[PDB]
Ligand binder design. Structure first.
Ligand SMILES: [Cu+2]
Ligand SMILES: [Cu+2]
Lengths: 157, 159
């Protein structure tokens, strides 16, 4: 059962939603933390809005973007930063990562009201290009921006 | 038109693979790909998810993080040149393409003539792209590396 975090934000021609489920077994194995040692699979859902500035058709998934997350507990004041890898499930491509909450050895990441950030950079760092000719070129990529959600952690769904 | 179709599309491994080549295209960041002034065409590969894609990609979606290598052989001059097609976005959506020197190649043999185009396609796992493999949200294995063939006549930069 997937649980929404806050509600989506529409900026830079993209709909940015936050969701998390139970830890998810992943392949290739070894890159992302093992589902056995995690408490959640935090997924970032980012799709091009209608009339996207950068030529991405409406509803398409936005690939090659660099997503760094920050996980703050308002009650705990404990925060850790990590990365969200590009992943695909049976419902479509997305960005995700398994994170250990209750199992965070240093604690403070179990129970709590939470603040979730997404630090989003454009695909150019990953070698992704774009046309800039007058006939088929598209606009500039957004500059790095941040997105913040508020959610209260319920344990594993 | 400004855009030339190459052969006919292929429907394999849950994807539609089509090829088209353009005039040389100016693209940023500059330096990654051969500059448009030094090229004669812009070869592009259009790859999208078919209906009921075995790897969880919605119908019509662009297939990202793919490793696409191309081989262009002038059947009449026997010349062969290889390269890779980068992920890039135009005004009509993302694709894989590259600026290629044909008549402008110094080794010669890539002028007008009959051509055999081949794409060498490997799955996204080499880029670190992930897969759900749980019972509820899991998707099937990725295809093994394969290739598709096109044939077309080249008579210079599209017009
Ligand atoms: Cu996921
Ligand atoms: Cu292109």
């Amino acid at each position: 059962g997937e649980v929404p975090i806050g509600d989506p934000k529409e900026l830079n021609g993209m709909e940015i939603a936050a969701v998390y489920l139970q830890p998810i077994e992943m392949e290739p194995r070894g890159i992302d933390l093992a589902a056995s040692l995690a408490d959640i699979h935090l997924e970032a859902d980012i799709h091009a809005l209608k009339n996207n500035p950068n030529g991405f058709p409406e509803g398409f998934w936005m690939p090659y973007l660099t997503i760094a997350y920050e996980l703050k507990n308002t009650d705990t004041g404990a925060i850790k930063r990590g990365t969200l890898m590009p992943i695909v499930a049976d419902d479509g491509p997305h960005y995700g990562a398994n994170i250990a909450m209750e199992k965070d050895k240093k604690g403070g990441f179990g129970v709590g009201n939470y603040e979730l950030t997404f630090y989003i950079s454009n695909p150019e760092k990953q070698g992704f290009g774009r046309h800039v000719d007058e006939e088929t070129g598209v606009g500039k990529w957004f500059e790095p921006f941040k997105v913040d959600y508020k959610f209260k952690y319920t344990g594993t769904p």
